[PDB]
């Protein structure tokens, strides 16, 4: 009876975990002891009264004799010991899973305990969480016994301990921080529609407002744009661009292509690609340093952005027709049809939907597959031909001697 109360207090004082988890653990220990004795045939349930501590064990809804119940309670409480703790830790893991699994995408804070190159262990005080390399903001310094916060990436239960994976590199981290820093966002006045992030470098934010007379970007900017930079400094100097969200790609895409200016926006649904026309002087700015700009603009919009000028597009259309005409089974009319729909290289043709290629050229299943195989081969040959020329230009290292 009260022998159970002695145990639940002893573990609670030692292992430093609350009684309710311990009670559940002891119950599962009694239950397992009851399963082994009575067998798997009868349905078994166990309950321990919290106040008194007296175990209630039922088999198929029926109580069990005090005799056999005494054998069960003495087969557990007696040291043999760590098996019960395995049930208690299993209960703790189940509880911590329930709480943290609902917290996915949400900011959690803690202190750094151990730091290796591969991962960082953070103590949030209920349990130890790990921050892996992939989820880290590059070059950041996190030392033992220091305050740190991040978003919960995922929660899994594997061993008899709960695994909580964090991220400072996830887009959701920026989204949360913006909600905290900008009162218009946490008051729901301004909404964050879309987000595109390269962690530690640049993040594009598309926002909108229910009120049409309200400028959503200007609301986020505020006076000096200080609140936006505050989030950026928390990310280690990550650049944050806030733009205006729109349901039309004729609006949203030029907005996402900022600072660069856009002439024409062409939609190519079959390739899932938006073709953006940009003048020569704006070409470098449109792409970005390593191509960061368009890359982020693509994530933000949800399409594939291909930036070209008008002159090099006209050149691209002419060559694409001649190239596609080389393939037997591709008529000049069908070749022009592909180019008109946004297909330029052989890479684009190889990834075409067979069904769509059949309708456009009035082709059978066999004829469609054959064409695709040509595009695959030709794309592959073009790539290795470029590598050839690239390698033979590297053969000019003999210009030393």
């Amino acid at each position: 009876g009260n022998e159970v109360l002695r145990i639940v207090d002893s573990i609670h004082r030692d292992k430093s975990i609350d009684k309710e988890i311990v009670f559940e653990g002891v119950e599962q220990a009694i239950l397992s002891a009851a399963r082994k004795h009575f067998g798997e045939e009868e349905v078994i349930e166990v309950h321990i009264d919290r106040t008194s501590g007296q175990p209630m064990v039922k088999t198929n809804g029926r109580e069990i004799d005090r005799d056999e119940l005494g054998d069960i309670l003495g087969r557990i409480s007696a040291q043999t010991k760590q098996v019960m703790i395995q049930k208690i830790r299993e209960a703790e893991r189940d509880t911590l899973f329930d709480e943290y699994a609902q917290l996915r995408g949400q900011i959690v804070s803690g202190t750094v305990t151990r730091n290796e190159g591969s991962a960082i262990t953070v103590n949030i005080g209920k349990a130890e969480a790990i921050l892996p390399r992939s989820e880290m903001i590059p070059g950041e310094s996190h030392r033992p016994n220091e305050r740190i916060r991040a978003v919960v990436l995922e929660v899994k239960k594997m061993g008899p301990r709960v695994r909580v994976v964090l991220s400072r590199a996830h887009p959701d981290f920026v989204r949360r921080l913006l909600e905290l820093e900008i009162p218009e966002v946490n008051e729901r006045i301004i909404e964050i529609r879309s987000l595109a992030r390269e962690a530690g470098y640049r993040t594009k934010v598309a926002v909108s407002c229910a009120d049409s007379n309200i400028d959503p970007v200007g609301a986020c900017v505020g006076v000096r744009g200080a609140r936006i930079r505050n989030v950026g400094e928390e990310l280690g100097g990550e650049r944050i661009e806030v733009v205006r969200w729109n349901d039309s790609l004729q609006v949203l895409v030029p907005n996402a292509m900022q600072p660069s200016e856009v002439e024409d926006v062409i939609l190519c649904p079959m390739l899932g690609r938006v073709l953006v026309l940009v003048r020569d002087d704006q070409l470098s700015l449109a792409i970005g340093k390593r191509g960061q700009n368009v890359r982020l603009a693509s994530k933000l919009v949800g399409w594939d952005i291909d930036v070209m000028t008008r002159e090099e597009l006209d050149q691209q259309l002419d060559q694409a027709v001649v190239a596609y005409s080389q393939i037997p089974g591709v008529s000049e009319e069908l070749a022009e049809g592909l180019v008109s729909q946004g297909f330029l290289s052989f890479e684009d043709l190889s990834v075409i939907e067979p069904d769509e290629l059949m309708e456009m050229g009035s082709l059978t299943q066999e004829q469609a597959d054959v064409i695709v195989e040509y595009a695959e081969r030709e794309s592959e040959r073009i790539e290795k031909e470029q590598d050839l020329r690239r390698a033979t230009e590297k053969a000019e290292r003999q210009s030393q001697e």
Side-chain angles (χ1 to χ4, degrees), residues 309-326:
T309 73
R310 185 66 198 186
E311 288 74 19
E312 75 188 23
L313 174 63
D314 303 331
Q315 180 185 355
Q316 209 81 26
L317 305 178
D318 292 325
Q319 296 178 8
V321 177
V322 182
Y324 288 162
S325 300
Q326 285 183 327

Side-chain angles (χ1 to χ4, degrees), residues 114-160 162-288 290-331 334-358 360-396:
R114 293 296 186 181
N115 191 353
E116 44 269 0
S118 53
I120 299 178
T121 306
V122 180
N123 176 32
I124 62 200
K126 287 185 173 298
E128 297 289 341
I130 54 100
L131 177 62
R133 271 190 299 245
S134 53
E135 301 313 313
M136 285 180 59
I137 302 180
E140 277 195 345
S141 174
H142 302 287
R143 315 183 69 88
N145 286 14
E146 290 189 5
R147 294 293 294 177
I148 187 182
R149 59 180 180 171
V151 294
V152 176
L153 186 58
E154 68 170 4
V155 182
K156 256 69 180 179
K157 43 181 180 177
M158 12 218 49
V162 54
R163 174 183 177 91
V164 183
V165 180
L166 316 169
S167 182
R168 319 227 321 155
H170 200 277
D172 286 346
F173 192 29
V174 175
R175 183 183 288 265
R176 296 289 90 85
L177 289 173
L178 284 171
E179 290 169 359
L180 288 179
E181 207 71 28
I182 307 183
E184 288 93 328
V185 180
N186 58 53
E187 291 285 350
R188 300 186 54 84
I189 301 184
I190 303 300
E191 296 179 1
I192 303 172
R193 304 299 295 276
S194 182
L195 217 77
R197 182 182 193 193
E198 288 191 10
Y201 293 94
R202 192 169 301 274
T203 302
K204 286 182 179 298
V205 187
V207 298
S208 74
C209 182
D211 197 334
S212 56
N213 298 121
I214 292 185
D215 171 35
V217 179
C220 296
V221 175
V223 187
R224 302 161 190 84
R227 296 169 311 182
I228 293 176
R229 285 193 316 275
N230 284 336
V231 174
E233 295 304 323
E234 291 167 351
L235 301 179
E238 178 171 347
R239 292 305 305 169
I240 301 180
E241 308 173 8
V242 180
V243 296
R244 189 192 297 255
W245 169 266
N246 197 308
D247 295 324
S248 173
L249 283 79
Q250 296 295 332
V251 182
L252 178 61
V253 170
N255 289 5
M257 285 300 300
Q258 290 291 334
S260 68
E261 298 182 354
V262 173
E263 279 69 21
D264 283 329
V265 173
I266 307 176
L267 279 71
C268 306
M270 289 188 55
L271 279 174
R273 169 191 304 170
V274 170
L275 193 58
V276 169
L277 292 179
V278 161
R279 48 184 177 184
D280 304 276
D281 47 35
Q282 287 278 247
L283 179 62
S284 176
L285 206 155
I287 300 302
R290 297 314 174 187
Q292 189 188 51
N293 192 43
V294 174
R295 195 186 320 161
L296 290 177
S298 297
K299 282 206 197 73
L300 194 69
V301 169
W303 288 59
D304 176 72
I305 299 182
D306 203 339
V307 174
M308 304 175 65
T309 73
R310 185 66 198 186
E311 288 74 19
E312 75 188 23
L313 174 63
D314 303 331
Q315 180 185 355
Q316 209 81 26
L317 305 178
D318 292 325
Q319 296 178 8
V321 177
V322 182
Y324 288 162
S325 300
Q326 285 183 327
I327 302 177
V330 178
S331 63
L334 176 57
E336 287 178 357
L338 292 167
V339 179
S340 66
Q341 212 69 25
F343 296 89
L344 299 175
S345 63
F346 284 95
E347 285 75 6
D348 307 332
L349 184 53
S350 60
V351 302
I352 202 182
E353 188 72 19
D355 315 334
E356 292 174 333
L357 181 58
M358 291 175 66
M360 193 186 314
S362 301
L363 305 171
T364 61
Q365 185 70 35
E366 305 86 34
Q367 290 176 325
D369 299 331
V370 166
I371 293 185
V372 174
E373 291 197 22
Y374 271 98
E376 289 177 352
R377 279 181 54 88
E378 194 55 37
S379 161
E380 186 175 354
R381 187 191 183 276
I382 284 174
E383 288 192 18
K384 71 178 181 63
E385 183 182 354
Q386 292 173 357
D387 292 21
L388 190 62
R389 178 177 65 257
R390 182 177 292 103
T392 56
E393 285 176 4
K394 191 185 175 182
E396 299 302 323

